[PDB]
Ligand binder design. Sequence first.
Ligand SMILES: *[C@@H](CC(=O)OCC)[C@H](C[C@@H]1CCNC1=O)NC(=O)[C@@H]1[C@@H](c2ccccc2)CCN1C(=O)[C@@H](NC(=O)c1cc(C)on1)C(C)C
Length: 180
Amino acid sequence: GPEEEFGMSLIKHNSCVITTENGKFTGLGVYDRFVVVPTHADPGKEIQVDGITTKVIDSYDLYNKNGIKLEITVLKLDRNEKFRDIRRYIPNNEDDYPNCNLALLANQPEPTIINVGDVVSYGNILLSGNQTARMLKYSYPTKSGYCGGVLYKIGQVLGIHVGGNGRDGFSAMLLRSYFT
Ligand SMILES: *[C@@H](CC(=O)OCC)[C@H](C[C@@H]1CCNC1=O)NC(=O)[C@@H]1[C@@H](c2ccccc2)CCN1C(=O)[C@@H](NC(=O)c1cc(C)on1)C(C)C
């Protein structure tokens, strides 16, 4: 169906594998040379993008107005390739979303789409004891290797996967104002 194809097109055109010293993560290319990754990926001066050593020109760890981490890190990459602009799919406000999917690349044998079900704007949680804001929660047993996975519905790019406890999974919310 179109929602599955939209997800496969996000993988094909707007995803990459980001390797840092903390492991491999699914990276979302937002536009131009800007890619997002979970903050806990801890990208250094150089990362790998699909195995290619790439200098990071600038890195921006995003925080809310109270100085709480959003678990979104924006990276400007020193590479020739430009990502298709997907900002128009990113919502302007916090909300709930029924029947969402996660598009996974890193740590998978091939591009994978997981149907995670209904998503709710969940507020702040503690991820390994650290307060993290603007969480999107789903009742799906997400696992190790899923981080950076892209939360989406047809025509909507909603978040990036950051954590879970074996029952629930959590994404850092993507808001359009972060990138405009
Ligand atoms: C993704 C990390 C990844 O793929 O790295 C590749 C090298 C995982 C996903 C997680 C693992 C188990 N199920 C999942 O969905 N993320 C983590 O392991 C995160 C990570 C972290 C993220 C942000 C800030 C600090 C640390 C390390 C801890 N973590 C977790 O998900 C923990 N869960 C919680 O703390 C938690 C809190 C709540 C309300 O639910 N879960 C796990 C205990 C490891």
